[PDB]
Design a protein around this ligand. Sequence first.
Ligand code: CL
Lengths: 107, 108, 112, 106, 106, 156, 154, 156, 150, 153, 156
Amino acid sequence: ARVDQTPQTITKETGESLTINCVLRDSHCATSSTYWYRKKSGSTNEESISKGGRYVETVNSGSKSFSLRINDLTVEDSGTYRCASECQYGLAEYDVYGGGTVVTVNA
Amino acid sequence: ARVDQTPQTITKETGESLTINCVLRDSHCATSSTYWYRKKSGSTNEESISKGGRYVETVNSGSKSFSLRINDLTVEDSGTYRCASECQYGLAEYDVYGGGTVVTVNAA
Amino acid sequence: ARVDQTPQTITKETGESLTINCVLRDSHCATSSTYWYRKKSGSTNEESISKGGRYVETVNSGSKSFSLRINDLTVEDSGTYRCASECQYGLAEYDVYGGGTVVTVNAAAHHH
Amino acid sequence: ARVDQTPQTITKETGESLTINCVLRDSHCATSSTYWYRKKSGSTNEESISKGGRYVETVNSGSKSFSLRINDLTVEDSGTYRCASECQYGLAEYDVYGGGTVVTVN
Amino acid sequence: ARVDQTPQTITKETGESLTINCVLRDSHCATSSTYWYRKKSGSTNEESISKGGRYVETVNSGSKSFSLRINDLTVEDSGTYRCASECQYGLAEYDVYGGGTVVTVN
Amino acid sequence: RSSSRTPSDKPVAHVVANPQAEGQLQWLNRRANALLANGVELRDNQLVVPSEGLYLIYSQVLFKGQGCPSTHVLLTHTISRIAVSYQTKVNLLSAIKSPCQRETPEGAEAKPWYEPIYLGGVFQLEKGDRLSAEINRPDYLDFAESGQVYFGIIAL
Amino acid sequence: SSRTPSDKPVAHVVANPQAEGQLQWLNRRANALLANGVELRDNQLVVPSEGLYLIYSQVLFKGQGCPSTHVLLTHTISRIAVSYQTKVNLLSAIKSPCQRETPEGAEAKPWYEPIYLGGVFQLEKGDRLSAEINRPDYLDFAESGQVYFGIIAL
Amino acid sequence: RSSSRTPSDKPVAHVVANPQAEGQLQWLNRRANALLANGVELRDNQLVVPSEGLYLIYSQVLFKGQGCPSTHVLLTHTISRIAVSYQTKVNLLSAIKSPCQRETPEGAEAKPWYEPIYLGGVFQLEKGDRLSAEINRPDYLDFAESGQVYFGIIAL
Amino acid sequence: PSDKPVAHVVANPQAEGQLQWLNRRANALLANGVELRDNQLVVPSEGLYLIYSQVLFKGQGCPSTHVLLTHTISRIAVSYQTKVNLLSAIKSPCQRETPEGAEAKPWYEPIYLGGVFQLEKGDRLSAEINRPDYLDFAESGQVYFGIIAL
Amino acid sequence: SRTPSDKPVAHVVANPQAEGQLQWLNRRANALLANGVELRDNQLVVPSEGLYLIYSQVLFKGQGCPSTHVLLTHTISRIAVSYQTKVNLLSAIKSPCQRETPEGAEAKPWYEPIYLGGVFQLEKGDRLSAEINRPDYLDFAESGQVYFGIIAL
Amino acid sequence: RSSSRTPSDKPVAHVVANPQAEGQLQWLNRRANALLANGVELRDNQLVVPSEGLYLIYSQVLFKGQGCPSTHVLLTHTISRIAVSYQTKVNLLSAIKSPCQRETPEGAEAKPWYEPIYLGGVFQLEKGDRLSAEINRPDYLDFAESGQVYFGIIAL
Ligand SMILES: [Cl-]
């Protein structure tokens, strides 16, 4: 574990909306310091997805889960999206990641 | 701890029989009003075990100790089992509990 | 011979720490259900020592041995300490005990 | 070695008495918690010899030594005898053993 | 307080005499069970003064007072002397104290 | 750190007397070689049969005294049964023993006597029958060393 | 009898020499310690208080001749935590004792290879440390302190 | 939905190798079961001692290669110290290991060799001393799994 | 001002075929009561210590049969005055294949031991190896030995 | 039950499995509710006219102070048959945090107890009720830290 | 290597002082012509009788001094018994001896004196009785030479 991406492989068509869920399994990681990273298919320039507009982020502190809704899917929104969180207990502070691929086919 | 449930962790196989024993340490609780509760892992309901058939109970009023042997074990009988007793001395009335978990593994 | 309490006679000084070791010789008794009782010299009541804080318990199920290290000794901690364990095999269920005495001598507080 | 069993091989006749002596070399083991074990030749059971009657135990705390005299010897007392002691200093707790074989001919 | 020790600070020379008087202020304390305690200068241990020999005890129950006269004062008998009395009324029974110091030169 | 390694069934009971009971016969099962399982209840020093069937009933008692000046000493040991069908305590097994035939042990020093008594039999018991093993002189009980006094049943 | 008190959770367990083909941890031997709250459950060490610990273990592997080319000996100290209930490796080592060889015409070649692991970690209450090996059939717990495992609260 | 009230300590560090660092040994601290706290700082793949005192230094590296095509390969692993009093690289702990003693996989291959190296010792360090754990061949690192390569100090 | 008995001794490089421990060397310690007597460390106070030592073995070829490289830390105590091993390890450097009339192949095999033990006043620790002819004390900190009272 | 005893008495303790609420319980060791005292909806109903002794304790625990404006209150109130309005018999106020809004990430749990006690004349059917305004700071974890009781003197 | 070649019984003990004890009387059994066998245990310099019966108890002590520091020195030697029946130390055999006849070597120099004391008698002892051979002045003991000070019992 250490954060669990639920929709592993999704294949949607241009003009739709995919939701990606990540669930915290470490009771030291917080749903408050969540981050998102995208890697366009066939390129190793993993960028940081920004929270705003087409990319909406929902947090629920009760179930220790955060999700990332992506709207208006294009043919360039095909890649590998990973989630992240900041954990801190005593003298240790670290971060955790996931993994899950997105492919969008165009109409 | 008033009442001591002894087999804390059990792991038996399908088709077996587990014995869970409780000993009273409070000399005010009675072996006549004894109670048994099972709580299946993942459920939020504590169920009341009925005394008969698969559920056999052994009591000794001298030692203030009772047991609960459970036969024909399935794999859906995996959960936390607790024992209980009702105590009363003067103007006092209360009940007592324990703690102990069961896990049963399937077969083929 | 069914639980062996080793330090039978102990004499420590006020403010110190004694460890009592008990070894299970009956291979049906469990190191998970261990109990401790002390009886202060001159009084008739076995009280049950609780596991926490000043009363530290070390257990090894591999050799089926458990111990009880007691810190901050006073002069009111002088008494007979016994260990206990809960045994269970087939249709049989029983318990076992030991024996061992502690006497704590005072510090006398040097006056100038 | 920690605990020194001296008569390592004894061979007696039925109806006599073998004495096995053990001396402590570790000063943390106590002459108070002594144990004896025999394992009869051919069996996989180490039995614990109990002190009373036919099994006599002599202890001297000064020399940290104990002995085990066995009387009325039969032919069922053929095996390996070991002695034991409980040692304790600080945070350390252990036990110690020896070794020595007995054969009785009729 | 209860039990007023009157000579608070006294200064005598080796070869003189001191009487210390205590007057009861609690009407539950009795002049019958009176005790005296001194602490020799230098150590913080209370010794029990004996009511015989040098230390003579005079009691006057009418005035509810008791005293402790010392005949031959030496030089090491310099210290804080306190008086005591045992009181008992209803379900309560207790004791009471005072204070008074002696200094002896040569 | 252990559990059962074979099921085993039928009502069973083998209880041994309490050694730290100065002058009474209190039945115990929470000891090394004692049994009380598969439904058998020990109520007020009485065994309660949980099911109708054929049982084997037995008990042994050992009497010890350090001299007997009273010729008139009679030792009895009886297993009694009160059934749900006939609510009167009736004897199933009984025995009597005379320990003392002397000339009042006089002048010299004491002399301990030991007399044991054993009872056993097979009976048909019904649900709820209360069996009780009792003795008339519980001041001569010798439960000192070993399992010298006991009482038990087994559903065959 | 005892002497100076001493404290801190401490553990130094030694393999059972009389265990044939398995790794049983013991404390009731001369130079072994297990005190001040450390519990050894199912061949597992249970931390009694939260803090920084020093973890170490050595395993000695011995075989009488090399049968397989693809023989890999492993030794890991694992931790299953209360916050994250999955067993994760803290310290690990892998060792291949046999570079091909596989003695055909020979007279057995006994090999000895030890493995040592150590590190400092922050542990929580109830965490279970476990020292494990993949092939406990090559353990050489013969002479002395050749196999051991311990923690100490620093 | 939980609570935490845990204390702290003294200068400590336990860093783990970077798994996604291609053919290189990059030390990391922001990963599970890794520590870098109470003043120990990691600059240029080096640990900077925050206070003078007695320290315990340790490090392990795992070497893996997918064949032995050279009977003349040397694997070394050293923890060195450049100090404020003497600004020269000096070795505190060092070890050498020859991974391939055989006559190369001349026929079939797929013989992965694994050779670990461990270092440990206690030293007196001053404020500002920079400790560094290094290997001679960073192309044989096996950082594929977790806790295979690490390096740390702890203030005793 | 650092207390607690400590020791970290390193081998003498200019020592002919022997493992002689030195303390008056750059990065070595022997203080707060631990004394180095007859090539042995003497524990000055009862308590919990961390004992460690590493040895580096080097040879210029695999001679006849197998060589066993052993490295052991021993303790002779006042309570039980016989040398007993606290930590031990054995390693066989030569995987057979003794040089078959060809040229050498220098092998390196190090061995490390470490653990926590309870020591009493007057206990004598010694780190020792069986073949002091394979010691590689050419560099610094390749063979060393130390304790610290934790 | 081998002891007589009388006089209406009650000593109830909070239910630990209540999360954010103060439910008074009597069916626990060292708790009393006997000789006529009725407990309705978290309220004690006096069974007889006479002199009673009323007491209660609450323990408040917090993990951080988000606002200077923290007010902790504890009151034992009485609604009587003669005057059908709730009146306070015993009351106490405590401000646990004098500003000092904890800065950073320091988790320093604060604990504050409050105790009330007094003698009163109560009539038959009078309802006494012990309540607190912030049942979100109750620490009923350990044991006899929160309770409420009366005894007929 | 040899074997035993005699069978014998009856609890026996003949313990002799330790010469390497300096100023104390520690009893030894692991010396040439000394015995401690057949059940007798020696705890705190005390013999514990293992079985009830009639015993012969004896002990001798040798006192030596190289001068009298006073004309009022008293040498005593006693064998005591604390019994399970009556747990008070009572003297079974006792003797007193005055070593210095009006001297306290004043007009001349020091002078080595030797004075022995012997005790023996028959008594009935019970199981668990603790007998102790004791002296008041353990600094005048001369356990240098051979069997000069000893203590023993034998079951008749
Ligand atoms: Cl904690």
